[model samples]
Target: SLRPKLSEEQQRIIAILLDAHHKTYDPTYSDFCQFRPPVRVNDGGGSVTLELSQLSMLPHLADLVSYSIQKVIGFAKMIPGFRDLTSEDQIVLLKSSAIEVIMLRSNESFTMDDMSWTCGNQDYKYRVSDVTKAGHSLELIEPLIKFQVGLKKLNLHEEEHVLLMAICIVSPDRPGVQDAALIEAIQDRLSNTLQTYIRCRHPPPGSHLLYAKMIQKLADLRSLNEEHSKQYRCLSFQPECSMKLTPLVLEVFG
Candidate 1:
């Protein structure tokens, strides 16, 4: 549909109105009404009311408008690179960034199989099916699961430590059920779990920065693909490659 054109002054008024509407709907605002109350009127001893908050939450129209403007600005800035690219190059760039584009971080964690819980608390053990059935709540379980799985192969005295940094861009106080809420929640949970898991597995090395470096080593190993023998051979004696969680697992305890 064609947008209605307005005079400069009219456009200014529209922009101001839009900005106000957007601010009211922003997740950061306290006392921000998630659902707006209804407006009612009485006439001849009868009253009628209309629901407006229902419309506000349905489409999140204000955010859509704001994002549309930003996307247009981004696309415009990419024009020079877009114009210079071959069709193949353009396709590859689009495909490579596709995951980053729409994949919002989730508040839950995921599990690969039965008998273990990753995120949240260890008291909760879940099967793979339970993880799948978690639906929206899956946003809460995944980070802890990921952290625990990463910790399963480490030992007490391995000099190298494993660390993870999960950052939730949005705060918990933010209102609404949007993707950002889930993302932030998952990140916060994962960050907490990572710290706890590390502390249980090893002593802190003086500063947070040093602990981070130790975890970086673990992250590097976890990122490897085990399908190829050459890669696996490089990690032949490593605790993870051997699946040895403790010296007890190594038969030395026997």
Candidate 2:
């Protein structure tokens, strides 16, 4: 597909974005620390209960989400023309795309079992069923796991992942975005760069479907977030469940 050429500065922006994405995945950084191990509870009877402390973690997780969004936004500001957009448009893009970026970054915690997400040298593993019991349905859990598995199978490079994040951030259809044309143009440039990078890194013969598969993952992430919001809302009503969401989280999902 023919596309406008990216200038040197545009290419530099891509590199900066990729670097920021890498920093988020570095275990040494506290901002990207893995989730803690699940806590076990004893039911008075013979039955035992496993709890992931999801409610407790929600605030911390949300903070990480905000952190990643800010990082990406910072990178975007350095882009040739990104700061020219209205502040309202900028906020709309950041708010609308934050969850999707968080989902991608959190893929680090997803396990291969399709039933557990682990953290910290695999010391703690949380069950998918427990997550469903908290509020999510099996429908949501199934696809969420599938998306994580699909991403693992794809073995995406850091460059590919960051480019996808950039694309998500510059979404044109986000409500309240006043300069849709400019936003779309930015996305197009990012998309073109992604395609070219994929071709170069994956060389012909079988790389044809890689780009399409990666794009489909973004759609999967969107669907997963919808289901996540549904569960988050349901959990908010049951204070006894220990999954209490933070005030910031309430505002974000409200």
Model 2 regions more than 4 Å off: 1-10, 29-81, 113-116, 121-130, 204-206, 239-243
TM per model? 0.19, 0.75
**So what's the TM-score on candidate 2?**
0.75
lDDT of 1 by residue, 145-184 (tens): 4444544433323212211211211122223323444445
Task: List per-prediction Cα lDDT, in the order shown.
Answer: 0.30, 0.64
Judge candidate 2 against the unseen true structure and give its global Cα lDDT, from 0 to 1: 0.64
Choose the strongest candidate by lDDT.
Answer: 2
Top candidate, metric TM-score? 2
Candidate 1's TM-score reads 0.19
Candidate 1: segments with Cα more than 4 A from true spot: 1-58, 61-82, 95-254
Model 2's C-alpha root-mean-square deviation from the true structure amounts to 4.5
Cα error, residue 140 of model 2, in Å, equals 1.9
